[PDB]
């Protein structure tokens, strides 16, 4: 049982060569003070005289003093040892991946506006800013800026949309007379070096590394980037032989290197400063620069609803040197083409990192030639379809040809509590409300403290720690959950069904209550006409049945609604649950079936013959109590906390007391 | 010599109609003295306070 051995593994998790470690200084001295003792010069000397030892004690002190220095720049020395970030990039960027300044906040538009020229083709050209207010604060907008120039057909009727995408900043180009000696250095805070763009003299030239990189373009146009240990970005090119060497393609030969400069080639660059990481979800907008006989009619959010969404994106802290350290490493493995499905991760992890708390990359074996990836929009967990296809695209660059890139979101476990915190009124002059703005970060502290690191198992009580560490005048703090799943199909269980991974009691399984069309027809004066009647139902679980299964009962049915077959009966038991309705309608019937130590849920309403459309909505959201403590996780199910989007999941009750 | 003191219940409406104002300590009243209004005598919440 557990783990039996043979001399097994090695040196701990991680090397440490250790006759480096620190050690206290009386154990220092206690090493060395032995040192001196035995030398052959003098066995005479007694050391614990005190005379000797303060001065003995004096040569630990500079040789302690010293050491941390020898000792230190071995972590430094060493990645994954680096305790300095700006030493873990530098190995990093060394290994070919580096960590980024924070990335704009980025989104698209699509803008209906009429010219007022009527000409066949504006375009937007690449630079005009627009404003967006943060979230719910109107104080200040956000401006972000046209990422590139676009252009529109001009609609008959004359009213055109063109559509473009917005990354958030202002445009800052900058050009510099290249020369010989002399860094090139952008000083500016606030840069990305992913919106960094360039012009030479003319043409421009792409750090290989993560724009294109694959084009007929020969690789003598490149640069590099590098971070001043300052906190500034530095530029960098390749300087003779620029591309890989020789005669290459050219029949003449000799050498370029390129940029002589002399004057040669004056160097402009354009790029954006950014705001962001506060600017993630930006709804309202302002079309905030003018042209020529341009008038934006009107700016409507978001083309392609997810339909969940939120306004822009990215910024970034940027900084991390936890998912940072390990990470180049896979780089540092892997070639820039990205093949290992890790690979895939780690790559997916560079560009978006700041997208992306979390991605899952795998393989579904059903679908071969699909890379499928489970990534975390990290402000959301759906990323907005055009991400989606973004990335997709930008990562379809790095890929096997016949491999197609595939992203879903995954299903998602959601985790609805109700929480019962107590606090004294007195101990606390701090305004109460507040406090509930404390608690509600610190929430999601424990989360993104473990839960979407590895989604592993689930402890609700640990994440309840935090919570009741949060203000320390909380005198108490309870809460209950509810395990919750969404569906996609009300109509009919997915294949497989589901399952919770999660021993959850029975009876205890639940879903949400939803109106239905009934043919049957309902008038009132004034109303005339109406259709018909409309009420609701809702998915229950029916009791434990021995073997631990149980079949699913629908929701309350009148009279006349479902046609009786013979086949199908009202289920008509006695356990099943049952919503209190105006109706008192007690058909029930079995839609389908389920059993609990499985965890596996199944049903179809092609069982019923209820029609599809008869019901109103598409999705509903699914209701569980794990009867176990902890909530396990498996494959692409995870528990996550996202209250903003989903506040309903989320619940907290605040208990004052004196 | 001893603050003249007293205690006062006082009804008020929050603007704001949260669930609990303190008053904190150090709120100053006027008072006159016995029939005259001259001055009033000025006089300062004793301490934090909600309701």
């Given at each position: 049982a557990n783990t039996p051995v043979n001399y097994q593994l090695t040196r701990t998790a991680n090397a440490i060569p250790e006759i480096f470690v620190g050690g206290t200084f009386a154990e220092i001295k206690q090493n060395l003070i032995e040192w001196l003792n035995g030398q052959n010069e003098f066995l005479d000397y007694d050391f614990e005289g005190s005379r000797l030892n303060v001065l003995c004690d004096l040569l630990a002190y500079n040789t302690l003093y010293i050491q941390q220095f020898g000792n230190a720049a071995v972590y430094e020395s060493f990645m994954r040892t680096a305790n300095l970030r700006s030493s873990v990039v530098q190995a990093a960027q060394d290994n070919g991946y580096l960590p980024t300044s924070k990335s704009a906040a980025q989104t698209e538009i699509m803008l209906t506006c009429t010219d007022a020229l009527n000409r066949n083709y504006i375009t937007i050209p690449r630079g005009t800013r627009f404003l967006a207010y943060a979230k719910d604060t109107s104080v200040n907008p956000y401006n972000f800026v046209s990422r590139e120039d676009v252009i529109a057909i001009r609609d008959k009727n004359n009213q055109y949309f063109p559509r473009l995408k917005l990354a958030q900043g202002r445009i800052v180009r900058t050009e510099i007379i290249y020369d010989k000696l002399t860094p090139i250095i952008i000083y500016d805070k606030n840069i990305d070096r992913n919106q960094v763009k360039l012009y030479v003299d003319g043409a421009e030239w792409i750090n290989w590394t993560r724009k294109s990189m694959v084009h007929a373009g020969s690789t003598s146009t490149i640069y590099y980037m590098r971070e001043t240990i300052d906190g500034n970005t530095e530029f960098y090119f390749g300087e003779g032989e620029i591309s890989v060497n020789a005669s290459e393609g050219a029949l003449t030969a000799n050498y370029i290197g390129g940029l002589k400069p002399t004057q040669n080639s004056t160097i402009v660059i354009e790029y954006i400063s950014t705001n962001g990481a506060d600017a993630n979800g930006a709804v309202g907008f302002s079309y905030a620069d003018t042209l020529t006989n341009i008038t934006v009619i009107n700016i409507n959010e978001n083309p392609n609803d997810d339909p969940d969404f939120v306004g822009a994106d990215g910024g970034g802290d940027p900084e991390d040197i936890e998912r940072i350290?390990?990470?180049?490493?896979?780089?540092?493995?892997?070639?820039?083409?990205?093949?290992?499905?890790?690979?895939?991760?780690?790559?997916?992890?560079?560009?978006?990192?700041?997208?992306?708390?979390?991605?899952?990359?795998?393989?579904?074996?059903?679908?071969?030639?699909?890379?499928?990836?489970?990534?975390?929009?990290?402000?959301?967990?759906?990323?907005?379809?055009?991400?989606?296809?973004?990335?997709?695209?930008?990562?379809?660059?790095?890929?096997?040809?016949?491999?197609?890139?595939?992203?879903?979101?995954?299903?998602?476990?959601?985790?609805?509590?109700?929480?019962?915190?107590?606090?004294?009124?007195?101990?606390?002059?701090?305004?109460?409300?507040?406090?509930?703005?404390?608690?509600?970060?610190?929430?999601?502290?424990?989360?993104?403290?473990?839960?979407?690191?590895?989604?592993?198992?689930?402890?609700?009580?640990?994440?309840?720690t935090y919570v009741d560490d949060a203000d320390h005048s909380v005198i108490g703090s309870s809460a209950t959950i509810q395990m919750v799943r969404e569906v996609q199909n009300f109509y009919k269980t997915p294949e497989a069904g589901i399952k919770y991974n999660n021993q959850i009691k029975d009876r205890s399984m639940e879903s949400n209550t939803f109106s239905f069309n009934?043919?049957?027809?309902?008038?009132?004066?004034?109303?005339?006409?109406?259709?018909?009647?409309?009420?609701?139902?809702?998915?229950?679980?029916?009791?434990?049945?021995?073997?631990?299964?149980?079949?699913?009962?629908?929701?309350?049915?009148?009279?006349?609604?479902?046609?009786?077959?013979?086949?199908?009966?009202?289920?008509?038991?006695?356990?099943?649950?049952?919503?209190?309705?105006?109706?008192?309608?007690?058909?029930?019937?079995?839609?389908?079936?389920?059993?609990?130590?499985?965890?596996?849920?199944?049903?179809?309403?092609?069982?019923?013959?209820?029609?599809?459309?008869?019901?109103?909505?598409?999705?509903?959201?699914?209701y569980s109590d794990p009867t176990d403590d902890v909530i396990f996780t498996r494959d692409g199910s995870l528990i996550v906390f996202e209250n903003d989007l989903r506040p309903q999941y989320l619940t907290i009750d605040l208990e004052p007391i004196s």
């Amino acid at each position: 049982a557990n783990t039996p051995v043979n001399y097994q593994l090695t040196r701990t998790a991680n090397a440490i060569p250790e006759i480096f470690v620190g050690g206290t200084f009386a154990e220092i001295k206690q090493n060395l003070i032995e040192w001196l003792n035995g030398q052959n010069e003098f066995l005479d000397y007694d050391f614990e005289g005190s005379r000797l030892n303060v001065l003995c004690d004096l040569l630990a002190y500079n040789t302690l003093y010293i050491q941390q220095f020898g000792n230190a720049a071995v972590y430094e020395s060493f990645m994954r040892t680096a305790n300095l970030r700006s030493s873990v990039v530098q190995a990093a960027q060394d290994n070919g991946y580096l960590p980024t300044s924070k990335s704009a906040a980025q989104t698209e538009i699509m803008l209906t506006c009429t010219d007022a020229l009527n000409r066949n083709y504006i375009t937007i050209p690449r630079g005009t800013r627009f404003l967006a207010y943060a979230k719910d604060t109107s104080v200040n907008p956000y401006n972000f800026v046209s990422r590139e120039d676009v252009i529109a057909i001009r609609d008959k009727n004359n009213q055109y949309f063109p559509r473009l995408k917005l990354a958030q900043g202002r445009i800052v180009r900058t050009e510099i007379i290249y020369d010989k000696l002399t860094p090139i250095i952008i000083y500016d805070k606030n840069i990305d070096r992913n919106q960094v763009k360039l012009y030479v003299d003319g043409a421009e030239w792409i750090n290989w590394t993560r724009k294109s990189m694959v084009h007929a373009g020969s690789t003598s146009t490149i640069y590099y980037m590098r971070e001043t240990i300052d906190g500034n970005t530095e530029f960098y090119f390749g300087e003779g032989e620029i591309s890989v060497n020789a005669s290459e393609g050219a029949l003449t030969a000799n050498y370029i290197g390129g940029l002589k400069p002399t004057q040669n080639s004056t160097i402009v660059i354009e790029y954006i400063s950014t705001n962001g990481a506060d600017a993630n979800g930006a709804v309202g907008f302002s079309y905030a620069d003018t042209l020529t006989n341009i008038t934006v009619i009107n700016i409507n959010e978001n083309p392609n609803d997810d339909p969940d969404f939120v306004g822009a994106d990215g910024g970034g802290d940027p900084e991390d040197i936890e998912r940072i350290r390990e990470l180049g490493t896979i780089k540092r493995e892997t070639q820039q083409r990205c093949v290992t499905a890790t690979d895939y991760d780690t790559f997916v992890s560079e560009r978006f990192g700041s997208i992306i708390q979390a991605v899952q990359t795998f393989t579904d074996s059903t679908k071969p030639g699909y890379a499928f990836i489970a990534a975390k929009p990290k402000s959301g967990l759906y990323l907005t379809t055009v991400q989606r296809e973004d990335i997709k695209n930008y990562l379809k660059d790095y890929n096997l040809a016949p491999i197609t890139p595939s992203i879903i979101s995954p299903n998602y476990l959601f985790i609805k509590t109700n929480l019962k915190v107590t606090y004294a009124l007195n101990k606390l002059q701090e305004s109460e409300q507040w406090l509930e703005g404390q608690i509600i970060d610190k929430i999601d502290r424990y989360y993104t403290e473990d839960v979407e690191i590895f989604n592993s198992s689930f402890a609700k009580s640990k994440m309840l720690t935090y919570v009741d560490d949060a203000d320390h005048s909380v005198i108490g703090s309870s809460a209950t959950i509810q395990m919750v799943r969404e569906v996609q199909n009300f109509y009919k269980t997915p294949e497989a069904g589901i399952k919770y991974n999660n021993q959850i009691k029975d009876r205890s399984m639940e879903s949400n209550t939803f109106s239905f069309n009934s043919g049957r027809k309902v008038v009132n004066p004034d109303t005339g006409l109406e259709e018909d009647v409309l009420y609701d139902v809702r998915i229950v679980s029916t009791d434990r049945d021995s073997k631990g299964i149980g079949k699913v009962i629908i929701g309350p049915f009148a009279s006349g609604d479902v046609t009786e077959n013979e086949n199908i009966q009202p289920y008509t038991g006695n356990d099943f649950n049952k919503l209190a309705n105006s109706d008192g309608r007690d058909k029930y019937y079995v839609i389908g079936e389920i059993n609990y130590p499985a965890d596996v849920i199944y049903w179809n309403i092609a069982k019923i013959n209820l029609t599809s459309e008869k019901f109103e909505v598409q999705t509903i959201e699914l209701y569980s109590d794990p009867t176990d403590d902890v909530i396990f996780t498996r494959d692409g199910s995870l528990i996550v906390f996202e209250n903003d989007l989903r506040p309903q999941y989320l619940t907290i009750d605040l208990e004052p007391i004196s």
